[PDB]
């Protein structure tokens, strides 16, 4: 029974570090991974002692309900497959509606495509980082409102 | 070629950093190892100001041709971490005053690239994940905190 927690879909480098950063801030995280029985083990240890890894498929809404999407703070589609991330978002919008969704893009080319599934937050690691680099090198100061603006869709 | 930026690479990160720098009004000199044909396609994707020097970033003579002696900073943004680390070393061998920026293609290479001491290190996956965590945790990120994440 998970509540007021974050659900992370995926086991990519972006997903793992986001889970760790969330744990470090005292947040509860529930991970869903389609990895093999053997790999789930290496991942649970890769994460820590309070690792809540639900072996399964996030495209399936029954696993999402199980993971607790009804009581989470947000669901994060962070795998290296943009088709699965786009779908995780669709499934979620189809279950609750008011649930907050975050989606990271693996291939910057797909950005306009995922815009179509309307996630609350979109993160393209390559474009976000390049835009920030451009500003910082240009001596421009980036305040909090500018940063959040590059994330909110 | 003075008071400008030099980007070594033609990866997705490289191209968008060049585009973003141009939009901010900054001049940029791009060096890539792409074949004659691919070079042409690259210049067209970078607009009319496309200053593309087909060559080898590891060769300090192409770096001089690109104007590292008079640049604002040199950016190592290709998808090959060996080449990015070498570009940095090359730069520190010429000016030792030239600002170096390096983007890690493979997160596992982070520790080994810190050994070449670049001025700025951008690990896209780590940077992005950390900012997501912060924002979802309700924190506010000010320019100082952001910069700190980039400074090596």
UniProtKB/Swiss-Prot annotation, chain A:
Cytoplasmic side stretches: 1-153
Domain named RCK N-terminal: residues: 3-123
Record's subcellular location: Cell inner membrane
Domain of life: Bacteria
Function: K(+)-specific ion channel. May play a role in the defense against osmotic shock.
Subunit organization: Dimer.
UniProt similarity note: Belongs to the potassium channel family.
Name of protein: Voltage-gated potassium channel Kch
Native species: Escherichia coli (strain K12)
Range covered out of full length: 241 to 393 of 417
């Amino acid at each position: 029974h998970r509540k007021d927690h974050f659900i992370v879909c995926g086991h990519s480098i972006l997903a793992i570090n986001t889970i760790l950063q969330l744990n470090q801030r005292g947040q509860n995280v529930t991970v869903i991974s389609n990895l093999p029985e053997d790999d789930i083990k290496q991942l649970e240890q890769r994460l820590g002692d309070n690792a809540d890894v639900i072996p399964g498929d996030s495209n399936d809404s029954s696993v999402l309900k199980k993971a607790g999407i009804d009581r989470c703070r947000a669901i994060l589609a962070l795998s290296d497959n943009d088709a699965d991330n786009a779908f995780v978002v669709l499934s979620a919008k189809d279950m609750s509606s008011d649930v907050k969704t975050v989606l990271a893009v693996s291939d910057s080319k797909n950005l306009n495509k995922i815009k179509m599934v309307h996630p609350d937050i979109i993160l393209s690691p390559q474009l976000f980082g390049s835009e920030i680099l451009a500003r910082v090198l240009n001596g421009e100061e980036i305040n909090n409102d500018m940063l959040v603006s590059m994330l909110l869709n």
